Ligand binder design. Sequence first.
Ligand SMILES: CCCCCCCCCCCCCCCCCCCC(=O)O[C@H](COC(=O)CCCCCCCCCCCCCC)COP(=O)(O)OCCN
Ligand SMILES: NC(=O)C1=CN([C@@H]2O[C@H](COP(=O)(O)OP(=O)(O)OC[C@H]3O[C@@H](n4cnc5c(N)ncnc54)[C@H](OP(=O)(O)O)[C@@H]3O)[C@@H](O)[C@H]2O)C=CC1
Ligand SMILES: CCCCCCCCCCCC(=O)SCCNC(=O)CCNC(=O)[C@H](O)C(C)(C)COP(=O)(O)O
Ligand code: SF4
Ligand code: SF4
Ligand code: SF4
Ligand SMILES: [Zn+2]
Lengths: 185, 169, 331, 63, 157, 60, 385, 108, 62
Amino acid sequence: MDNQFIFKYSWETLPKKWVKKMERSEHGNRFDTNTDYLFQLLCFLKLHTYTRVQVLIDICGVDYPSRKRRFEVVYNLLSTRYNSRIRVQTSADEVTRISSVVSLFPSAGWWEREVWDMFGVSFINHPDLRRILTDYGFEGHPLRKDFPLSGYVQVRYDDPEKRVVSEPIEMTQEFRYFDFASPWE
Amino acid sequence: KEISKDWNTVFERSINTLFLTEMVRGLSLTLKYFFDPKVTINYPFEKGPLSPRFRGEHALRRYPTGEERCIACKLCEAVCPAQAITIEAEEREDGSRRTTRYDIDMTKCIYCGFCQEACPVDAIVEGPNFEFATETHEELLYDKEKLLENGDRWETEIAENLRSESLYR
Amino acid sequence: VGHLARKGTGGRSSVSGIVATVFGATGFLGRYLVQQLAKMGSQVLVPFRGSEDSPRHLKLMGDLGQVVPMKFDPRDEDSIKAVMAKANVVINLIGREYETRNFSFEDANHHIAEKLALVAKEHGGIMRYIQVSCLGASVSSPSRMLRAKAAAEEAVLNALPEATIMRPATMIGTEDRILNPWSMFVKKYGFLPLIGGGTTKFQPVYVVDVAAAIVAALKDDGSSMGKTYELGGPDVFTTHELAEIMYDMIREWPRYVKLPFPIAKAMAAPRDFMVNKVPFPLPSPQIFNLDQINALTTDTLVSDNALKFQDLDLVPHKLKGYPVEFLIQYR
Amino acid sequence: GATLVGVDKFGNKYYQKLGDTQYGRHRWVEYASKDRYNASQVPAEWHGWLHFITDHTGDELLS
Amino acid sequence: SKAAEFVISKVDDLMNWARTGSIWPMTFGLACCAVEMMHTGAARYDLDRFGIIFRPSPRQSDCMIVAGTLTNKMAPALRKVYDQMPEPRWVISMGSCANGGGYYHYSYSVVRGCDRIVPVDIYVPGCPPTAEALLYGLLQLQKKINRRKDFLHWWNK
Amino acid sequence: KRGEIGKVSGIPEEHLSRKVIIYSPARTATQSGSGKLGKWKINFVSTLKWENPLMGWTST
Amino acid sequence: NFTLNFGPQHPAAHGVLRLVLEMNGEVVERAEPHIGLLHRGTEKLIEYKTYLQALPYFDRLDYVSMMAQEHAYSLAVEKLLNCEVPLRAQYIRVLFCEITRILNHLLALTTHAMDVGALTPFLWAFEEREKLLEFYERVSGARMHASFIRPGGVAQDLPLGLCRDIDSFTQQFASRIDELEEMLTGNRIWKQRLVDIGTVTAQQAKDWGFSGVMLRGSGVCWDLRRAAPYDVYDQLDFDVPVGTRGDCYDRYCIRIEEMRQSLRIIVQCLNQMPSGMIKADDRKLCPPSRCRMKLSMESLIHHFELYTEGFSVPASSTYTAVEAPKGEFGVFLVSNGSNRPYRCKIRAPGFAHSQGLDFMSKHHMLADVVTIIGTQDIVFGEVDR
Amino acid sequence: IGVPPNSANLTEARRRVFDFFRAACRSIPTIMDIYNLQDVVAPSQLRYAISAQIRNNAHITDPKVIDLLIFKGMEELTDIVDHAKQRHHIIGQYVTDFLKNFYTSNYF
Amino acid sequence: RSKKSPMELISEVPPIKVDGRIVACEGDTNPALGHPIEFICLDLNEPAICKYCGLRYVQDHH
Ligand SMILES: CCCCCCCCCCCCCCCCCCCC(=O)O[C@H](COC(=O)CCCCCCCCCCCCCC)COP(=O)(O)OCCN
Ligand SMILES: NC(=O)C1=CN([C@@H]2O[C@H](COP(=O)(O)OP(=O)(O)OC[C@H]3O[C@@H](n4cnc5c(N)ncnc54)[C@H](OP(=O)(O)O)[C@@H]3O)[C@@H](O)[C@H]2O)C=CC1
Ligand SMILES: CCCCCCCCCCCC(=O)SCCNC(=O)CCNC(=O)[C@H](O)C(C)(C)COP(=O)(O)O
Ligand code: SF4
Ligand code: SF4
Ligand code: SF4
Ligand SMILES: [Zn+2]
């Protein structure tokens, strides 16, 4: 269906308290809702006849280290029947737990696990929530703006103990950051 | 109810599934390629085809007079996505802007050609050589003398490659 | 002083002006001494003589040229001087446990050590020199190898007065040459002969402790130069409970057989090495080494009035847990 | 040998065969030496001709 | 002992010829370099011509080809698999990621070179190396094997 | 004070006691534009940067 | 019940695959893949590099369809920048996307056949694959990781003799496809090793996010280049194959038909390709010609300022998706407004396909697991970003 | 099962702390006999080590921080239970001054 | 020969003779394969050195 038609219908049909912030543009229709109404909003968008969002594309995450709700998880959705694409995003925190959507879309389990791996945002009643991408025993969440690019620990082989061990990082050549940003912009 | 119940067609199907007609037809195809000429090439004597745009060994060209083309503009170092190029420069007593240390870590290099297409003087190029295979790691840290030796060795062909594709881009 | 210039945090990519020519680093102590040296950033040069793949397991220690293997010829004096040309410290560990059809006990230890010391003196740039001998290195010892070690360690002092001597005692490790053959021999047969008959006490030491002592002696330009340390373990073991502490993890069936000392030494030598000298590459000796039996005739405990670990403020590892843990792969 | 195309200062000789419509056995090298020949003896002038980079023989590329 | 020196020389030459004419590399390709190394084993740049056949297990493989990025989670597995190999045990580091960092070289989960886990003998650089580049690297490894007087060294020692 | 988020961040504990400087970088003298102002940054004092004794690269 | 683990080193499992699965002695009850062995860390690295320096990361994600990911990244940048592209650039981008589709389908089919046990089609498909890898090696430098597709247009113009050679290849590629298909479709072993294996229903594929061949295998006529045609695809006519019951065999037939459709599209692009410039005249994201940067002051200034600083994408955030050969490949850019991307999440199609292995391998036998792995065409560069 | 929602009060936080400590103890023998270590370390001292690690964060006041710390605790415990952590990682991980700093480096 | 570095090798090339107040230096005879064009005012009695190539231009007249 037409992008503006989704805009008008969804804004009129949806309960008013669910959507805190909403945006219409050519880039994509956006529904910024609260952290606790996310499950209900996703359930409504999944089952309603006119807005049949059946497949969840991915669960993203953006770190803004300048606001109280540092993280922002983004839910990209797709309506195969009506050929539309809606995007729902909420705000998170280092300690705030956000309800999972694995019950609706079973494919969201791995995306939620990787969001927890990268940003450290826990998900409520998520079955088997654990690190998926980083190695075993990893400390810190790499995709936060705080995490250094090179990390904190290295990996090498030590001969006294016949195994591969870990040390604090010792870079042979530091990452040269080139500051190309210029005024008049 | 998928049905093929006809007196004539049951005989036709029950023979194909009994005398291995599909197997024989797929078997006789390989024998066709058994007698066909092969597509391989003996590598050490015959080399595979390449292109004038091939991305291989880094080389530091120089002017036909004998002065090196590199002017320490440091565009190659800034554009290099892998951050493999390190440059140090100072003004010689002649007053010319030249490099003293221009070393490329060929183990970080990704052979993308961004450095080659960023030079305003065509100082650095990627020659057609693809046969490094050094036995030591620190031999792969080219250090502005290996670059110039490569440029001298491949100049007669790098110049031809550059002049052939200069009409492009 | 002038050398040992610290640069950055201690680690792989650190810097330390301890560019060293460690001789015999392809052996048992070498893979630990080089690891200790390169772990703190100091460059090390590893001169070898055999096949070029023997020291390739040492290149993992450093960072892009901190471990440079080089080839020499012990019979040629010029090459062994060339390998140490760009060095400010030399460590010598060259020594053979047994006879060789090309190198005798005197040639392997005493003559090589004398040549190395003279070459180092000629170079003039070796600020610290270390030559390593064994603990029971008395000149009157019946074993031929110990006499060669004594001659080498006395000649080194005359050649270089400011040359430390390190004297470990039957170091044990993952590929050591006193415990591994025992477990191997037990695996095929399992009766585990005791040549000495027990009650031959000595002090085993952990090889990592030996390497730590050597590197600490390198890192202190003080009351260590010229001194001859006597390295030893924390406990006074003997072959019986040493065999027990070996066998406990090995398990299966424990069997002990006692061989009288004189008949054992009179039987081991003829079968192993008394007349077979035609083939140059004669098979390496098993635990029936002729001189290892003679070395067991007297207790090799550390002298009470000599230098120890406590004089160099480090503690030995307890030879009951981690140091012997490598026997799980045998069990 | 359909055609022999030039020689080299190192002694390795260069041949050429022309096919009809399918690639294969177009141009190769006969190395002068035999001590494993290091697989890299073609000079810069003849390197382009061998890899089909340029149609110039290589002796012509020197001029 | 000059009379036998000919015998030792011939034995060494025969042993080196045997080890060079039949190399059975073990494929450890785990990134896009594995695709190029797979093209190398394909019909065009035939590896089987040079006596090179890939093995599925390390217990019967001569050398090991590390082709691809070596992350932190895979380095223990690489070391473990390298440990279960026979005496010759050569290692070839194909690709820019394997032979020291790579395009990434700055990451929480990338080992800056397979030479920090296993001792590498031949470095084949390229991102990704051409099949001809891998063939040249294997020829260089064969040349390295020729420089092995292992019987002579045993005799002299 | 209130290092609970620091405790749960998982970063090595020895790096939680680092002294940092907070400032807004000033406009460069060599340029007259003011398009790089008003943004604050934390300045960890990464003073120790020695030189690699193989090629002169700056290690850290 | 015992829980043995995979990790074979030969390329049967495409390498870098660790699979811990529990069986009931002969029948597998639950397979839990352990991804992360190839997590290079591209998502964190993109943020530290200019919009141009980050392009070659997209070659290293799905390294059988190199120009498919570059297409998605370039389209995302263009959508954020609002930059028009000349027709010739669009046509050549479509042509090379179809070539990537052919390459990826060939590689997937023959690795799947190698897993099953067939060996001959693998070598034939690679002797075919070289003839397109050399096409890649002609337009740009590298055979595999060709940074040919830039955000503005393409990197540089096609060589003079490329079109004739591409047409010559397409003359016989159909007969080569028929020769490869002769040994697999009619073969009775191939049917019995694929029929009734890994059945996925359309509702269940939609739930598990199986966009791609795994979706069309289940009877859903969902094609991203038909539903949301991005480049010049309305002009090109092609058919979208749809399976009847999706189980490891209708997917294979769909891949055959998609190879033929890609051949048809390549022929159409060759016939209909116009003449004109290849890079947009905006000159904010496209560099000047080498003859102009050495003659004109403004051109040299632009070259200097875009080969170091790069173009600055205005502050916004978009999600773009293209029909990669594996499936729906999506790049989600968040633009800070500077010359470096603030966040670039990459929606790899293989992630959901590998996630869906657990239910697809339910109550199957062990030999019916390698065929499931092969039939979904998973590569771990994209799965582990 | 699934992740618990949250803890409204500190009493629930203390209850979760006690449950995590109890579960870690009931999992202490399996990690004793899965890493093949019996005589090197007795099971008693690991209890004191876990108690010290738990008591380390005694100054935390926010219930959410307590919940997330406990969740990280279960994650680490579950990682240790499986044969996934490297060998003897656990035993290594779970075991005036001015002149001393001055003689080493300028950065202390 | 290789014992002559470009420093002491570019100085052995005699300065170019040209008429007029300024001269345009492009490096190679093909403009696309040289350096960016560099107009130099050769008014002083010393030869005017191109900053890219290092070639020296001097005024034949006067
Ligand atoms: C010239 C010298 C050559 C010497 C070598 C001999 C030729 C060898 C050629 C071998 C080439 C194919 C080799 C493939 C090996 C594997 C193929 C096995 C496939 C198979 O077993 O198929 C079965 C039928 O095979 C069969 O039934 C095979 C037996 C043939 C039966 C006889 C057929 C005609 C009978 C007429 C009798 C006339 C005389 C009467 C008086 C049934 O396949 P399915 O699984 O689909 O079945 C559904 C039931 N579950
Ligand atoms: N740690 C211990 O158990 C004891 C140590 N020691 C002393 O410490 C040294 C190390 O003990 P160990 O580790 O058993 O020594 P090894 O038996 O391990 O061999 C040590 C090194 O000596 C080298 N070497 C031997 N003969 C010659 C030679 N003729 N010319 C040149 N190099 C030679 C070997 O090189 P290649 O392998 O190439 O021959 C080897 O790398 C002993 O030699 C001994 O002097 C004393 C008592 C016991
Ligand atoms: C092999 C082991 C596997 C697991 C290893 C895990 C090791 C780390 C364990 C987790 C570390 C954590 O911080 S996770 C648990 C963190 N929870 C807390 O720190 C609670 C704060 N303290 C209090 O509430 C009280 O003071 C209290 C001290 C409880 C009682 O004292 P009182 O009653 O007087 O009040
Ligand atoms: S871009 Fe070219 S001229 Fe500039 S510094 Fe690099 S090599 Fe030298
Ligand atoms: S090819 Fe690319 S990675 Fe290599 S030096 Fe040039 S710009 Fe850097
Ligand atoms: S060298 Fe290049 S192609 Fe090979 S694994 Fe690394 S990034 Fe991929
Ligand atoms: Zn000029």
